[PDB]
Amino acid sequence: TRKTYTLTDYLKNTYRLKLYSLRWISDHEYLYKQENNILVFNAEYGNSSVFLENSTFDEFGHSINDYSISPDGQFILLEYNYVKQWRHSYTASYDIYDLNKRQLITEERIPNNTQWVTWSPVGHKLAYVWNNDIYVKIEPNLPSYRITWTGKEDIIYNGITDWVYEEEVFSAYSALWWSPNGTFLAYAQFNDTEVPLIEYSFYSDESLQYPKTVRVPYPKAGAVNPTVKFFVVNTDSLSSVTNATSIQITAPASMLIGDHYLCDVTWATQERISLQWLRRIQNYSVMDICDYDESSGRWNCLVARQHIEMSTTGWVGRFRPSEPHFTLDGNSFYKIISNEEGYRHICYFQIDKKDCTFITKGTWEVIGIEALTSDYLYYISNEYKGMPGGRNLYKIQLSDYTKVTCLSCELNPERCQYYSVSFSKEAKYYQLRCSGPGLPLYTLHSSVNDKGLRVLEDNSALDKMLQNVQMPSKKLDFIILNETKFWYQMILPPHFDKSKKYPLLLDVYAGPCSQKADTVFRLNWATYLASTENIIVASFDGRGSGYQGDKIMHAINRRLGTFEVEDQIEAARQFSKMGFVDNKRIAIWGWSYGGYVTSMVLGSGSGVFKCGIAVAPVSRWEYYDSVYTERYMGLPTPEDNLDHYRNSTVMSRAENFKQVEYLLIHGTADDNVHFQQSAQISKALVDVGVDFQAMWYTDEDHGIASSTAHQHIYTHMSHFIKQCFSLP
Amino acid sequence: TRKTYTLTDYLKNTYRLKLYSLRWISDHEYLYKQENNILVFNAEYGNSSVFLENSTFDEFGHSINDYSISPDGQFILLEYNYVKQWRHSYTASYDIYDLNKRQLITEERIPNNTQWVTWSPVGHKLAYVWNNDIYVKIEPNLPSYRITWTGKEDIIYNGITDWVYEEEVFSAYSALWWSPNGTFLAYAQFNDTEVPLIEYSFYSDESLQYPKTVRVPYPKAGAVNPTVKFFVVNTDSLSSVTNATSIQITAPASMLIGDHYLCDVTWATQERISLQWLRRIQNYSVMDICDYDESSGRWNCLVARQHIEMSTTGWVGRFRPSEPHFTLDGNSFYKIISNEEGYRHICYFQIDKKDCTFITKGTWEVIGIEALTSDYLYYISNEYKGMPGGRNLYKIQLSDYTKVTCLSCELNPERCQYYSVSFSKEAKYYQLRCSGPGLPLYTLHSSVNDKGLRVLEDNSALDKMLQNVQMPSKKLDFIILNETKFWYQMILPPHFDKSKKYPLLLDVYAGPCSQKADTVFRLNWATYLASTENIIVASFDGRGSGYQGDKIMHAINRRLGTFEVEDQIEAARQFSKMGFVDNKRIAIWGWSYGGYVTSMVLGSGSGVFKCGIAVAPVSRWEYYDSVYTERYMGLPTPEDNLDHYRNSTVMSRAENFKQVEYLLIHGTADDNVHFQQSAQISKALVDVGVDFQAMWYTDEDHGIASSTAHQHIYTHMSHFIKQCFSLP
Numbered sequence A, B: 001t002r003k004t005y006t007l008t009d010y011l012k013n014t015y016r017l018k019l020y021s022l023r024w025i026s027d028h029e030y031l032y033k034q035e036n037n038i039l040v041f042n043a044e045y046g047n048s049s050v051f052l053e054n055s056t057f058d059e060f061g062h063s064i065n066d067y068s069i070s071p072d073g074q075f076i077l078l079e080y081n082y083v084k085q086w087r088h089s090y091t092a093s094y095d096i097y098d099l100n101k102r103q104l105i106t107e108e109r110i111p112n113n114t115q116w117v118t119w120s121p122v123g124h125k126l127a128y129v130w131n132n133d134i135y136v137k138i139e140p141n142l143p144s145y146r147i148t149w150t151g152k153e154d155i156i157y158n159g160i161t162d163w164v165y166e167e168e169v170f171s172a173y174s175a176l177w178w179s180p181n182g183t184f185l186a187y188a189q190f191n192d193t194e195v196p197l198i199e200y201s202f203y204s205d206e207s208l209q210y211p212k213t214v215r216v217p218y219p220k221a222g223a224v225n226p227t228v229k230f231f232v233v234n235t236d237s238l239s240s241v242t243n244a245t246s247i248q249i250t251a252p253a254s255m256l257i258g259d260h261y262l263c264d265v266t267w268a269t270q271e272r273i274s275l276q277w278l279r280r281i282q283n284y285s286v287m288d289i290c291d292y293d294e295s296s297g298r299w300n301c302l303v304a305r306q307h308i309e310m311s312t313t314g315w316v317g318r319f320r321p322s323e324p325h326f327t328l329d330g331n332s333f334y335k336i337i338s339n340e341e342g343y344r345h346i347c348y349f350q351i352d353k354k355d356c357t358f359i360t361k362g363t364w365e366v367i368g369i370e371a372l373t374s375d376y377l378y379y380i381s382n383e384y385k386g387m388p389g390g391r392n393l394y395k396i397q398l399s400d401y402t403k404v405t406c407l408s409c410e411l412n413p414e415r416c417q418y419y420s421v422s423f424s425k426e427a428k429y430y431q432l433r434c435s436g437p438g439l440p441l442y443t444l445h446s447s448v449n450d451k452g453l454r455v456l457e458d459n460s461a462l463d464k465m466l467q468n469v470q471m472p473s474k475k476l477d478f479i480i481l482n483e484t485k486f487w488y489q490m491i492l493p494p495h496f497d498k499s500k501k502y503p504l505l506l507d508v509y510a511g512p513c514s515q516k517a518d519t520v521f522r523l524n525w526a527t528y529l530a531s532t533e534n535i536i537v538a539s540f541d542g543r544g545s546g547y548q549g550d551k552i553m554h555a556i557n558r559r560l561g562t563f564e565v566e567d568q569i570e571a572a573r574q575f576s577k578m579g580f581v582d583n584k585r586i587a588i589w590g591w592s593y594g595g596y597v598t599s600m601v602l603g604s605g606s607g608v609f610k611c612g613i614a615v616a617p618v619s620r621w622e623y624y625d626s627v628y629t630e631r632y633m634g635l636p637t638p639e640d641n642l643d644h645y646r647n648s649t650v651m652s653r654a655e656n657f658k659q660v661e662y663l664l665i666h667g668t669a670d671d672n673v674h675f676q677q678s679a680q681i682s683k684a685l686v687d688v689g690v691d692f693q694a695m696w697y698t699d700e701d702h703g704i705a706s707s708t709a710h711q712h713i714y715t716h717m718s719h720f721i722k723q724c725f726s727l728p
Ligand SMILES: CC#CCn1c(N2CCC[C@@H](N)C2)nc2c1c(=O)n(Cc1ccccc1C#N)c1nccn21
Pocket: A167, A168, A319, A508, A509, A511, A591, A592, A593, A594, A618, A628, A673
């Protein structure tokens, strides 16, 4: 008899999903790290050569974290001494190895504790950030040119983002943008002078006698936000004698009237740059198109070339205004914008014209623009079979928009319904990446006639290993609420019997633009729950979920903690009424936004759920950051939305926790959703005489990702779900 | 069937212990609060009068926290706006009410945010601390005289103690001492400049957007300690001089050689003060006796009057060197010191002779000196029946030491074995306060003849209530370990059957000078557990315990976390041998030092215990304060005792916790035993893969004493014990 997928299998990664992460270096070749060696692959034929041997740095004296080959293939940036900061930020030490003269560079080295580093897009110049200031290196063995002198820790950030812009704006620490050929270097400067500081204890190793206090400039909803300036420097006209001159591009008058943000930077051509600015009330945005004036040496942003993007029903973009995709001449562009029916589609714009032309339409949405040529635009969309949880690669003929070709739909319909893509420099080749419903499949294709060149990775090994395992299945379907269909997914136990009552665990995210019902193949905690414990694990996408139009997505506008909470209950209420679900054994679990939703559901007084687990939950919107919270909630002032901020808390619902079993988990060093949020939930339940289970994780952050902690969290939650469902 | 003593009875205080709190205003009168009215009682006849009617402060506009009448009974200090700080410290607003004029004082008011206030011991002079500076009022409506100008928040403390002096040295916030007739005001000044800060978060009400960081000067073991200086000012000179001089009394040269402490201040006469100094290595103490020199305005301490108190086996005193009791003339004093056998007895000294005469002796100890008259000295001791857990009042004739009467022994021997006393101003009358083994009994006696005047409170109301309740019983006995008697107590369930096997809960303290095996009557959590859950709640006084000689008390000197831990394991084994204990159902629980012993016991690998609860435990000696830790452990340096500090941590035993069910509980705003200690236990358990139960109490301190958190903690603990013992 065959084994089940156990907790130890999930925790020890017994069953590994094989990947194929390649790095395009031209229109014809990619790099692939095989057996610790870097190899060069000709996409057309499949043949390789050794680019770099694993033995090359055996006598290095440091464990190399990562590598970054210069665009010209002449130099290798060696990353070591990695110290993680936030989600994307880190400091490390760098060394440059000359690939041609087979020797490390010992002259003018990149300093230690370097905040960010990047090769120019072409050649081998380097831009780097150290002690909050930007430095440029025209050649690796040559002295650096200092670009900024204003850099100050926790106050003035140049070429790097502060806490909020990293997390909610650029999803990156870098605030550097090189021009296509690397002539110009564009950067953002952040000022956090009056932004209040989130403070928390850090315990460190047992040896630290007194705990350390961590102080992060973090703007909570309604607090003073950072300020932003935008600059462009010419890296071709740098001097050793004279200090560098940075040209400032100011925000439009429409933004300068009040609080705003820089939300997108995208070069159009070698001398044209686009910028998107977003107001603190995230329903108004402005794009500026800025050209380099060779005579004056200034960057002029014509008013005729401004583009207003706005929303009357909600905020702008899924999480922020979308990225424009400029043509070779940069005189026109393509951008995903929400249409008149509230569905996200590609619009075509002229730089000097107000009206744009939608090139796509329908009751589905475009996920992203992936590649652009003079003949075709390539994009991902959830159009195929009307499944909002599916993803496929499409090409639209730019001369005849009626000529839309799906490139992945029919490749393998049974195994592959969720795709991502990666194109070569001029889109000659593409790698398709299938992530479900079947095991991941990686393939290489060529754009000329959309030929299927070869299979890169098929995970056949994992398939052979999974043959001897009692694996769970996945049902993707929908329910109808108020004439609207909403999707759900259920991880069903092996040998599923529709004539038996199974306990049910509802796995929730339910945040704005979330999607928990999809065709992706996952090997996680829910796998073990269904495989070993015979628990149905369900997720549902109600109002406020994304990829289905603004009518659904904007339903929770100015009203977080309402519809998305109600809808989760209505979904569980419906599942309970199915013959195969044991209505006396229904549980709910969520992390981050899902933890807030889990806690609002447990305190709703619905009687549907027996128990629940909240991990690093948000408890009161006034405790979460400005950028995210205010996008959906607006400002927490009496003139704006203070009443909703006030009545959308977990705390006010404490009394309702009397008829449920609750497990509240949070890491002490969470810089994202501060421990404060959970400390306020516990205090409220204590205040109304409600018994619950609690677990803190010393020095753990939002991820609770340290190997020991990760094993500890899932062990502790497993015992709880098991005790709740009367399972041995 | 009769009801049991339930968890609700304990949490809701259904069965109330009546007290008799009187405040002696003279030699024959005391104050008593009956129905919110303050009555004055004539001790000789028991006849009263309303001293101050409940209606007196109806339209005051504030709830009065407490009152204090001036020694002469001309004024009443009304305390309101009570804001708690640490164990003894607080802030408050104060008003003075003229008893004569029956009017409130509206001029030259005591400021708001007053740290401490005290009347002169004679008359109506006032000394108070505001903003770390000492001020004096000769008259309540007249302007204050400023004494100090160095006062600085968290740096200089004049007249008030710092964290460590309040907690561990003086057991008071106060650091001002008036002379007997109020002419002089003596005070200590503490300098916390180089003292490191303990920083922790304070979440406060849900309305507080950003948590506040609480920063306290706190010396952990081996860190920089506060420095101290002592002064004396002639308050009678204030109205004749612009700025009266605070004369310094310097520490002796034997103290100035290194770090030391001021540990005792006692006035002997109108012009004579005694000071006790203690080295940071607490095994050497010095008493200086200082006389006022009328011609120089100086205080002089003669070397002929200097008394040395030292220890070769341990530290000086039980927790600090004891207080001297001077005879009227101030030419001699009585002091409790450790004798040649290691037992604490009363010594009689001449102020200028280094050799003292012991006035008491035997294999028992003197707990304290209560009153000193021209013919008699009154003291509490544990001599009666050789029970170290008992307490009685004795009378010794100063002209004949063979003349010792026990004033309390036989009054009610079945009901009363533990006593405390309160004497009138010149010891004319005494209130005896009996606390067990029967219901507490308060009686008033006269010293002229030692005759009982009347029963003040007998608890007949409670006795009537307790008759319809199945109450547990308490057994107090001993076991002979290595030729030594080691005492224990048991809270036995009702109808205790010697032939039955009962689950046992070992209730722990086990710190140096502890006593958990006594004769006090208590209505607590152990009452509920034994009464309702049929659990035997046992306590044991092993090596390191007090009131039994230095041989037992100093057994743990420089070795905390050893014998006192091992003896608790031995205790449980010996209990199992008694034949009425289920060896499969033995639990261990403790708070503070008890929390540490529980945790150390749970990580020993002994197999004796199934489960255990640790509340606000010490985990590593280097995290606890200097004064407590170093008294027993010395310094955490390689030349002293580092090896033992590093070997006595809970963390080093995290692997043996795999054998037990552990519950870890701590308050987040714990300024005494820092949350850091449980944050380091949990981390160590997570690292070695151990599952456990945790609970944090938001904004709760070492006492977890808020009405809500108290009920919450005992409810959570009860569930855990019941689960461990498989009780429904
Ligand atoms: C608090 C919050 C939030 C909202 N959030 C965001 N946002 C945009 C990026 C930046 C961030 N600050 C705010 N992305 C989010 C979430 C969010 O809750 N989950 C659920 C989630 C978080 C953690 C672990 C499991 C699960 C699951 N399942 C999630 N899953 C994938 C992406 N995401």
